[PDB]
Ligand binder design. Structure first.
Ligand SMILES: *CC(=O)N1CC2(C1)CN(S(=O)(=O)c1ccc(C(F)(F)F)c(F)c1)CCO2
Ligand SMILES: *CC(=O)N1CC2(C1)CN(S(=O)(=O)c1ccc(C(F)(F)F)c(F)c1)CCO2
Ligand SMILES: [Cl-]
Ligand SMILES: [Cl-]
Ligand SMILES: [Mg+2]
Ligand SMILES: [Mg+2]
Ligand SMILES: [Mg+2]
Ligand SMILES: [Mg+2]
Lengths: 231, 9, 231, 9
C-alpha cells in the first residue's frame, strides 16, 4: 500500500488536514492506511474513516443517479450513456468493496465493545445497501440479504448494550429504516422501526446532558422527517 | 423525494 | 493515453455527461482525450475544456489555500502540514502543466481566429497565474513573466479584432486585472485596466442583442465588484 | 477578500 511507509499518527493528522481542505479522496486513502496498521480505531478515528468514505461514495452515488436518470429517459444516442454510467457504477462498487474489505480484515472481528462493534456492523450494512442501490442481476437478492444481516446483528447488539438515545444506535435504526423503505420494499417495516425508535428515544432524553441531548435529538428529527415523507 | 439517512458529523 | 481508443464525438458526449454529473476530473480527462485527437476545437468544445479544468484546479487551489494558512499559523507539530501542502501543491502544478502542455501542443499554434487564439492565450495566462500563486523559489519571477506575456499577447489581439463587449475580451481583461492586483503587486495597473475595460464596454452595449447584453454585463459587474474591493 | 476572476458559464 502507498501509505505503508507513513506513521499511523501522521496518517491520522493528515486525514484531519484533508477533512479541513475538503479533500475526501485523500482523507479516505489516509484512513485506509491507518486501518491497515492493524491497531483498533478510537471513536474519533472511526469518525474520520466514516466521514471520508461517506463523502467519496456520496459523490459517486449522486453521479450514478444523474446518469441512470439520463439513461432511463433515453430508453437513439449510441452506447455512451450506458458506458459512462457503468464506469461510475464500477468505481462506486470498488469503493464499497474496499470499505467492506477493511471491515472484514479485520475491523469487525477485533471489535469487542458495543460502540465499535455496532458502528462497524452498521457500516457493513450501509455499504451493502449502496451496492444494492445499483444491483440488478442474479446478485441483487444476495446483496440485499447481506445488508439485512449486518443491520440485524448491529440492532441485536445495540438493543442489549446501548441506551435508546445512544447516537450510534439511533443512526443505525435510521439507516435500517431507510433500507426497509428504499431497498427491501417494506415501507411498513420502515415506518414501524422509525416510530418505535423515535418513541423510545423520546422517553430516555431526560437522562442526558445538554451535549448528548443535542446529538440524540438531531437524529430523532431525521426519523420524524422520514415518517412525514413516508406517511 | 428520497429518504434521509444518517449524515456526517 | 487512456482515451486513445474512444471516438472524438464519444469523448465530447461523455464530457457533457460528466458535467451534468459534476464529475469534473472525468470531464477533464475526456476533454484532454478530445484535444489529443488533433482537430481544432469548436467554441462549445473550448467551453467544455475550460469548465472541466477550471473546476479541477479550483478545488486544488481552494485546498492549497486552506493548508497554506494552517502551515503559516504553525510557523511544533512535525513535518505533516508541510508534506501534505506540498502534495496538493505538486498535484496542482501537474494539472497546470497538463493544460499548458495541451495549449503548447498544439492548440495555440493552430488557432488562427480571434476568438480561439484569444481564448487559448488567456488560458495560458490563467494557468501560469495559478502556478505563480504557489511559486516561491528562483522560478516565481519567470512564471509571472510567462503569465504576463500570454495575457499581453491576448490583449493585443483582442483590442484589434474584437468589440469591447466581446465576452472573451472582457473575461481576459478581468483576469489580467486580477493578475496585476494579486500576483504582480501592481494595484494601480489593475484598477486602471478594470476601469478602462468597464467604460469601453458600457459605451458599446447599445450594439448588442438581449442575449449578448446579458453576457457582457455579467462580466462588467465583476469588474465593478473588484473595483469596489480595490478602492 | 480575494479578487474575483472569470467564472464558469
Ligand atoms: C464514538 C464512535 O464510535 N463514533 C462517532 C461516530 C462513530 C458516530 N457515527 S454515527 O453513529 O454514524 C453518527 C452520525 C451522525 C451523527 C449526528 F451528529 F449527526 F447526529 C451522530 F450522532 C452519529 C458517525 C461516525 O462517528
Ligand atoms: C466561443 C468560445 O470560444 N468560448 C465560449 C467560452 C470559450 C467563453 N469563456 S470565457 O471567455 O472565459 C467566459 C467565461 C464566463 C462568461 C460568463 F458567461 F460567465 F459571463 C463569459 F461570458 C465568457 C469560457 C469558456 O467558454
Ligand atoms: Cl466511459
Ligand atoms: Cl502527504
Ligand atoms: Mg426522432
Ligand atoms: Mg455494472
Ligand atoms: Mg506550547
Ligand atoms: Mg513545492
Amino acid at each position: 500500500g502507498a501509505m505503508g511507509s507513513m506513521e499511523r499518527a501522521s496518517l491520522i493528522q493528515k486525514a484531519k488536514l484533508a477533512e479541513q481542505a475538503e479533500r475526501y479522496e485523500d482523507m479516505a486513502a489516509f484512513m485506509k492506511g491507518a486501518v491497515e496498521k492493524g491497531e483498533e480505531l478510537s471513536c474519533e478515528e472511526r469518525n474520520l474513516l466514516s466521514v471520508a468514505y461517506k463523502n467519496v461514495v456520496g459523490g459517486q452515488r449522486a453521479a450514478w443517479r444523474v446518469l441512470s436518470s439520463i439513461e432511463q429517459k433515453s430508453n437513439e444516442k449510441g452506447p455512451e450513456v450506458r458506458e459512462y454510467r457503468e464506469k461510475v457504477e464500477t468505481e462506486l462498487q470498488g469503493v464499497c468493496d474496499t470499505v467492506l474489505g477493511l471491515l472484514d480484515s479485520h475491523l469487525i472481528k477485533e471489535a469487542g465493545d458495543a460502540e465499535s462493534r455496532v458502528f462497524y456492523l452498521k457500516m457493513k450494512g450501509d455499504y451493502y445497501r449502496y451496492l444494492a442501490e445499483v444491483a440488478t442481476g442474479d446478485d441483487k437478492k444476495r446483496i440485499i440479504d447481506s445488508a439485512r444481516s449486518a443491520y440485524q446483528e448491529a440492532m441485536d447488539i445495540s438493543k442489549k448494550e446501548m441506551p435508546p438515545t445512544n447516537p450510534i444506535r439511533l443512526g443505525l435504526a435510521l439507516n435500517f429504516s431507510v433500507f426497509h423503505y428504499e431497498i427491501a420494499n417494506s415501507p411498513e417495516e420502515a415506518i414501524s422501526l422509525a416510530k418505535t425508535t423515535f418513541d423510545e428515544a423520546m422517553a430516555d432524553l431526560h437522562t442526558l446532558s445538554e451535549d448528548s441531548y443535542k446529538d440524540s435529538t438531531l437524529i430523532m428529527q431525521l426519523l420524524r422527517d422520514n415518517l412525514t415523507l413516508w406517511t | 423525494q428520497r429518504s434521509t439517512s444518517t449524515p456526517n458529523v
